[PDB]
Amino acid sequence: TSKIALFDQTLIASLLQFKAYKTKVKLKISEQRNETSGEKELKFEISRSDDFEFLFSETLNNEKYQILARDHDLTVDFDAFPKVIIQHLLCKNIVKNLEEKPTEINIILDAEKNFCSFELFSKTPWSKGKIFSIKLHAV
Amino acid sequence: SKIALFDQTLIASLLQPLSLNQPDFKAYKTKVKLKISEQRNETSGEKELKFEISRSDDFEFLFSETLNNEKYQILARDHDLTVDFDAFPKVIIQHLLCKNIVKNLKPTEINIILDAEKNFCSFELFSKTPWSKGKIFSIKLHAVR
């Protein structure tokens, strides 16, 4: 409940299995309250305007986030995490890519389709600049 | 055939222990001279990258490390570097060349951790991001003696 949409946009992501493919994916990031505990939650939803069976999501609470900031050396707290992610996605690189090969979003699919890994990057002159990778589960 | 690629005085945050037998490390902002040079190994002829840290405050303050391609591969692995050994110095140096137009008319970005016996010091370089400290790499430098 108390679901506030913070980001809802179609992005170009390169999909992986091991042949790569740049495809359009809908990413939704929203704020919600856990029904039993009332605690703040962050929900990530990935879907495709073509594949209807392509539905993945993950809900993060503060505990789940601590694992994510441990694995990716994030210094931002759970509250600021979506603000800096959404700022990166919407405000930072306003570069239009002509579509009738590098991507800042990588999606790695499971052969069984039980999940997928959603990866966000901010390239640097010396590294790929991985921000975080989140495991999204089949809906 | 040693060539100095970078030679500048930088502000670093220095951590040094009270003693070899005590937990306490005290922290200081201090000016250190960093020198990055390229050279050829005398026996093998292979390309080497040398890092040297010194400071006018203490003639006994002399640390260095020489990286060859193999040593670098370990460093690249530990810090997820995607640039090759040849490009590494050019990129790091281009990063360090900082025109601060902060014409006044304290985040450091360099951390140095010392040994109690002064046998080594860990040199760490950072480029802050909105979500992280942005560690570029850390290099263990050894006492020059």
For the CA atoms of chain A, what is the radius of gyration? 15
Q: What are phi and psi of A125, to 5 degrees?
A: -70, -10
A121-124: which pairs have CB atoms within 8 A and are 24 or more residues apart? A122/A88, A122/A92, A122/B129, A124/B127
Q: Are A72 and A130 in contact (CB under 8 A)?
A: yes
In this structure, which amino acid lies at residue B32? V
Taking the Cβ of residue B23 and every Cβ of chain A, the question of whether any pair is shorter than 8 Å is answered with no
Contacts of residue A117, Cβ cutoff 8 Å, sequence gap at least 6: A106, A107, A108, A133, A134, A135, A136
Selected for mutation to probe chain B from A70, A120, A126 (highest B CB count within 10 Å) is A126
Q: Can you tell me which residue has the tokens 């991985």?
A: A130
Closest residue to A84, CB basis, from B82, B92, B130: B130
Q: Are B39 and B53 in contact (CB under 8 A)?
A: no
User: Residue B60 and residue B52: Cα distance in Å, rounded?
Assistant: 13
Three-state DSSP state, A1 = coil
Resolution in A: 2.8
Encoding tokens for residue B31? Answer: 């000016």
Q: Which residues of B touch A129 (CB under 8 A)?
A: 129
Structure obtained using: X-ray
Taking the Cβ of residue A102 and every Cβ of chain B, the question of whether any pair is shorter than 8 Å is answered with no
Q: Distance from A124 to chain B by nearest Cα, in Å?
A: 9
User: Residue B66 and residue A39: Cα distance in Å, rounded?
Assistant: 52
Helix or strand holding residue A80 (H, E):
none
Residue ranges of domains in chain B, CATH in brackets: 1-145 (2.170.210.20)
Asked if A127's CB is within 8 angstroms of B80's CB, the reply is yes
Taking the Cβ of residue A86 and every Cβ of chain B, the question of whether any pair is shorter than 8 Å is answered with no
Q: Are A118 and A132 in contact (CB under 8 A)?
A: no
Encoding tokens for residue B122? Answer: 């860990």
Q: Which residues of B touch A128 (CB under 8 A)?
A: 80, 82
Please state the length of chain A: 139
Longest dimension (CA), chain B: 54
Helix or strand holding residue A132 (H, E):
strand A130-138
